[PDB]
Design a protein around this ligand. Sequence first.
Ligand SMILES: [O-]S([O-])([O-])O[C@H](CO)[C@H](O)C[Se@+]1C[C@@H](O)[C@H](O)[C@H]1CO
Ligand SMILES: *[C@H]1O[C@H](CO)[C@@H](O)[C@H](O)[C@H]1NC(C)=O
Ligand SMILES: [Zn+2]
Length: 1014
Amino acid sequence: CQDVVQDVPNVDVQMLELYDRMSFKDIDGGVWKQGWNIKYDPLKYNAHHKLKVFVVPHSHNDPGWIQTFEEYYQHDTKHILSNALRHLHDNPEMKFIWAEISYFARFYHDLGENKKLQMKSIVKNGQLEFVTGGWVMPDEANSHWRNVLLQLTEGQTWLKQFMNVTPTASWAIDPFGHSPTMPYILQKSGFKNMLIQRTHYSVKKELAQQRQLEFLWRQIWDNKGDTALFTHMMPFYSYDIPHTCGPDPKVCCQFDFKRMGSFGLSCPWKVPPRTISDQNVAARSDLLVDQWKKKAELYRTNVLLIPLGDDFRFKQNTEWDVQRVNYERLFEHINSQAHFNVQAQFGTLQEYFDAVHQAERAGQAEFPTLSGDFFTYADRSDNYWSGYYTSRPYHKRMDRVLMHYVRAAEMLSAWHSWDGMARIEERLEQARRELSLFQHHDGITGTAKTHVVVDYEQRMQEALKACQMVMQQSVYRLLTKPSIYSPDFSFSYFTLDDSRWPGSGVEDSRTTIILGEDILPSKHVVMHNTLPHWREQLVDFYVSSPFVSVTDLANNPVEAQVSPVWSWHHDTLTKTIHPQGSTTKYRIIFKARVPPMGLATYVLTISDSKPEHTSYASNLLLRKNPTSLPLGQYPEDVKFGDPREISLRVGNGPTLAFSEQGLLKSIQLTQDSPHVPVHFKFLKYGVRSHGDRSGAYLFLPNGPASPVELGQPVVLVTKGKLESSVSVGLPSVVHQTIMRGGAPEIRNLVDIGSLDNTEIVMRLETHIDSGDIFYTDLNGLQFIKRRRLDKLPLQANYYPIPSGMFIEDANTRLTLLTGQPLGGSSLASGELEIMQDRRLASDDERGLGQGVLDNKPVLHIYRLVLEKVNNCVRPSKLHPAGYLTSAAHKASQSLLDPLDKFIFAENEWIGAQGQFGGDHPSAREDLDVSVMRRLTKSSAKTQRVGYVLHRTNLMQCGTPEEHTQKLDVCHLLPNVARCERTTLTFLQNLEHLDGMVAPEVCPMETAAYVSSHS
Ligand SMILES: [O-]S([O-])([O-])O[C@H](CO)[C@H](O)C[Se@+]1C[C@@H](O)[C@H](O)[C@H]1CO
Ligand SMILES: *[C@H]1O[C@H](CO)[C@@H](O)[C@H](O)[C@H]1NC(C)=O
Ligand SMILES: [Zn+2]
């Protein structure tokens, strides 16, 4: 195994280093506005060294953006595909690449058999070529790597089954900035090449000058280079035709033949395209070939890529004709005019890369190596696209919830083979596709029109319901005596209980367990743990009486705590934000202990009075002018007081101090240790009154944030033996700090209401001497070192915070883990900040055509980990990566993959068992079974189950290792007859494994295995 901490990779271009050196000056470079006037030596190309040009027709089809997926399909895409089939069939030399499989699959299943056959033939013969082959072209900033893999697998599995092809070249022309998580996943999925486009204009300029636009992109910690994937970065401002033929858009626009008038398009540079003819072909060719040769100067081989397309292009037959005919005339003239020394033709993306590597192999060029990422993107001036790291935060949080439900549903149902009548495969396929669709770069990014966001939400809601149905049927079969199990596949044996989604104050959706001497004395509940190690976590349920005790199925008492159900209200009468306690329902909390990838059953029983093993939390409402807060049967009276500083300690955990406004002020790790200053504060960013306005994409603040005026907020303190918390009703946010014995959990119920042109940020202030350094993660896969650069504007120092961020000095580290992707930064030494929501009245001119005024309450969740790191073995100062500690990693897992909770729906569960998976191996803490998916239907004689195993890298800080058993996923199911290592998509077998044993992977590595069973 490579050491990912101590050896600094030696690469030609290291993005953090390049950023530190670059000046980012935005000067007018001439017709190539962000570059310079390219000059070339006409003698470079000649009879023995020609410029091979590949013109690649393409059509960018967004699976939802300003129209929903289905509206685009009906109005545009089905026509584009229908006409592509006809035109390619009839013009053998014409080519076309396709990226979005969600649309292709939608089209293909609507085709008659005759057309399906014609389609397969033009794919088989190379005319229509799939690039990437994912369900969508995902966002690369907010997306979790697990969902990036999920959508890639969904599209590629469909392609393998129906088109018999697996793309090895990726095409990503629209994500707003790019992540190294893509080549990581792609290189482990059989890919050989990839192309990206939206990178900062200054980076394009810099790499172009060095001819470093094509590079072997390896991971930041990869010393050897085995993760390397050849990458081509386009050089210009857009993927449209005016910005793809060469440096001068006024000339290139003249070669987009759909802009002559009848199509309602024109050239903004004021020179229109002109139909190519025998009398103008020489002059048109001279202009075009000159653009081509200039573009060629920015690359190292004599093979040139010329994309030819734009949004939803190649729709009308007349469009296909006008583009094809004119280009055929240009090619015939250019290729027969020896003096140009050019051979041009229509080509596919793979054809381009194949020719590039043939040149490389002929010793024509050597490519530089590169590590790093391409955030935060700016397409021009100071227009940095960091706004979308936060836009539509409700759905960004929903993404993570569904992510986990999909994994749990596929894992829980994987244990058995199911009869087709159970509709398990059907429900899982729908859930995977709706979550996959939302990975689109106008989906999770929050950059779509209001009605389209609603469509994605409705789709995800159905996906959540599908996961629940599958999960609950699976639990029932897994925990019921086999000879008693009698399933009704449409029946709800269990109801899922989720305490954080939609969340208290967002939707009153949780069911109350109703017990009573005259109706039902007890209720079974079951917890599922998708992680491959034994796990304990507190779980809570609503019950109709405070006198409830908990036992496991061996009838052993389980210590429990009951607290009130508190809801916050904006009292329009008193003009205050305060809590009201339920008088009919209460929260019971207890520690669940669950096997690796298993289930554990508990029983809640009502009693006449206080049960022996249940304690009750005290509650204290701090505010001036208090009024009574009755709680029905709750046995402890609420206390009142004037606002004041307070301190709390649960178990042996840290002791936290809060200001009289209910916000954290300090953390004390142990009884002896000091009270380390850690202050939470909420602020607001505004919008500029002159110049460019912030929108769904752009963050253009009118300067540093201003503190939110807090007034004298109401603060609620609940103190319990198992869980305590401090909650405060601030303007736009009910902020909560929850303590359970370890790092606190933070929850923000964010309702930006009608606060127009406002962005709410949550900031942490400490004395940590971090200077200008901070760390943020990429797709929940790795942490990359960031350096705040004052030579760039504030918005440029904002980065995606998909799951975590931290700052540290030689001795102390503060890590903030998130349950949703949001944007954030460290704008001053000792600080961390992350945006909660943003409401913008204006459009930011990137095509959306609207601002963001559809905000809705959202419950953001976090874990805040303060730790001493002076004893930790960390990477050297020049290493571009950072790594989490064991506690921070566990804390992230508690947010993204919590225990799932199920309430038995009927009165009695006959045949109930207390546990499943007690014999599953409890793997080392840095290892996870990211995916467990049965790959065969029940009629398959040989059953196959796929596993994706990921090993992160945790810092060694002096804590002895201990125990843990080897996890061999190939032996998790009985009767194994074969074990194979495969690509991450499970589509290609890479290794037949001896003894049918799946070995574990190395730190930061990810592998897939498929076990076959008789
Ligand atoms: O013309 S336009 O206003 O629709 O926008 C252009 C071309 O200028 C874009 O490239 C459309 Se790109 C389509 C969509 O997925 C992105 O959100 C858009 C971000 O800008
Ligand atoms: C297509 O995949 C392979 C690769 O060319 C080919 O040999 C085979 O005939 C096709 N697969 C099937 C099952 O039709
Ligand atoms: Zn797009």
